[PDB]
C-alpha cells in the first residue's frame, strides 16, 4: 500500500511538473474563434466591388439614389460574410457538442465508476479519474494500471491428476522449470494447485496439451 501510494504521489508530481512546461485542445478553439472574430472585423474594411468601404463616404459624396446600388452591394456582401460566419460557427458548435458529449460520457463512466472498456479512460487498465476545472473545457487525470516487469513461463492449459482434467477457475498454470503454480493474468502470485481453485471436467484424453501433475487435496490432511 505504501508503494502504491508513493507511486501515485510521484505520478501526480510528474504530471504537475510536465503540465508546467502549451495545451493543444483548449488553445485551438480559442484561436479559431479569435481568427473568425478578427476576420469579421476586417470584412468591413473591404469594398466588395463597390467604390467605397464605409457607407458614410459614399452616402456623403453621392446621393442615396446614386448610392442605392453600392449600398445594396455592400448589404449583400456583408450578408454573405455573416452567412459564412454563421455556417462556420454552426460547424464548430456541432464539433464542440460532440466533444462535450464525449466528455460527459467520460465523466459518467471513468469518473463516476470504473469503466470496463479498455483504451477509453487512458492507456492500460483504468482505475479512477480525477476531473479538474479548465477554461472552456475539462481535463481528466486518468489513473491507470499497467505492467512493468514480466517473466517467461511455461504454461499448460489443463492438468490430469487421476485421469480427470483440471482447469483453473481464474488463474493459469505456470511453471518456472521444476514445479507448477497457478497465478492471475495481471500479477505473479504463485499458488499450490489445490481442489479449491481447480474444477474437474471430463477426462484428460481430449486435450492436445497437458502435463502430468498432482493435486494437494487439502481435505485429506485434515481428515487424519
Amino acid at each position: 500500500q505504501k508503494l502504491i501510494a508513493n507511486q501515485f504521489n510521484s505520478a501526480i508530481g510528474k504530471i504537475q511538473d510536465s503540465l508546467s512546461s502549451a495545451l493543444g485542445k483548449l488553445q485551438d478553439v480559442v484561436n479559431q474563434n479569435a481568427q473568425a472574430l478578427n476576420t469579421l472585423v476586417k470584412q468591413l474594411s473591404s469594398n466588395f466591388g463597390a467604390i467605397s468601404s464605409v457607407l458614410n463616404d459614399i452616402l456623403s459624396r453621392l446621393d442615396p439614389p446614386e448610392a442605392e446600388v453600392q449600398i445594396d452591394r455592400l448589404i449583400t456582401g456583408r450578408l454573405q460574410s455573416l452567412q459564412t460566419y454563421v455556417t462556420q460557427q454552426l460547424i464548430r458548435a456541432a464539433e464542440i457538442r460532440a466533444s462535450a458529449n464525449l466528455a460527459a460520457t467520460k465523466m459518467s463512466e471513468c469518473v463516476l465508476g470504473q469503466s470496463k472498456r479498455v483504451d477509453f479512460c487512458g492507456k492500460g487498465y483504468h482505475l479512477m479519474s480525477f476531473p479538474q476545472s479548465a477554461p472552456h473545457g475539462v481535463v481528466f487525470l486518468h489513473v491507470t494500471y499497467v505492467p512493468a516487469q514480466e517473466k517467461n513461463f511455461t504454461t499448460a492449459p489443463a492438468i490430469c491428476h487421476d485421469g480427470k482434467a483440471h482447469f483453473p477457475r481464474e488463474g493459469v498454470f505456470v511453471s518456472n522449470g521444476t514445479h507448477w503454480f497457478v497465478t492471475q493474468r495481471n500479477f505473479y502470485e504463485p499458488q499450490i494447485i489445490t481442489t479449491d481453485n481447480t474444477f474437474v471436467s471430463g477426462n484428460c484424453d481430449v486435450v492436445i496439451g497437458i502435463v502430468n501433475n498432482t493435486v494437494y487435496d487439502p481435505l485429506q490432511p485434515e481428515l487424519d
Binding site: 502504491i4 507511486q7 501515485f8 505520478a11 501526480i12 510528474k14 504530471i15 503540465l19 467520460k106 487512458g122 492507456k123 492500460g124 482505475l127 481535463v139 481528466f140 487525470l141 486518468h142 489513473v143 491507470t144 494500471y145 499497467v146 505492467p147 512493468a148 516487469q149 514480466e150 517473466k151 517467461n152 513461463f153 511455461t154 504454461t155 499448460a156 493459469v172 505456470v174 497465478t183 492471475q184 493474468r185 495481471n186 500479477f187 505473479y188 496439451g209
Partner: protein
C-alpha cells in the same frame, strides 16, 4: 541539396537512408527533422520499434510488478 520525392521536389535539405521518428511531416511516408554541424535531413518515417515477440504454444508471460501511471486527457 536537391531531393526528389513522391510529394514533389524538396530543396535545401539532404536525404539520408537512415530512418528515424517523424517530427515535421512532409508527405508520402517521408518526414524532415533538424538533426546532426547540424542541418535539415529528409528521411522515411520509422513505424515504431522493430521487435519480435517470442511466441510458443507452451510459453506464457505473467507480470510481477506494476507502475501506477496517470494520463492527462
Amino acid at each position: 541539396n536537391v531531393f526528389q520525392t513522391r510529394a514533389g521536389c524538396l530543396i535545401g535539405a539532404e536525404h539520408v537512408n537512415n530512418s528515424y521518428e517523424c517530427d515535421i511531416p512532409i508527405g508520402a511516408g517521408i518526414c524532415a527533422s533538424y538533426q546532426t554541424s547540424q542541418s535539415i535531413i529528409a528521411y522515411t518515417m520509422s513505424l515504431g520499434a522493430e521487435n519480435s515477440v517470442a511466441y510458443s504454444n507452451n510459453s506464457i508471460a505473467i507480470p510481477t510488478n506494476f507502475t501506477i501511471s496517470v494520463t492527462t486527457e
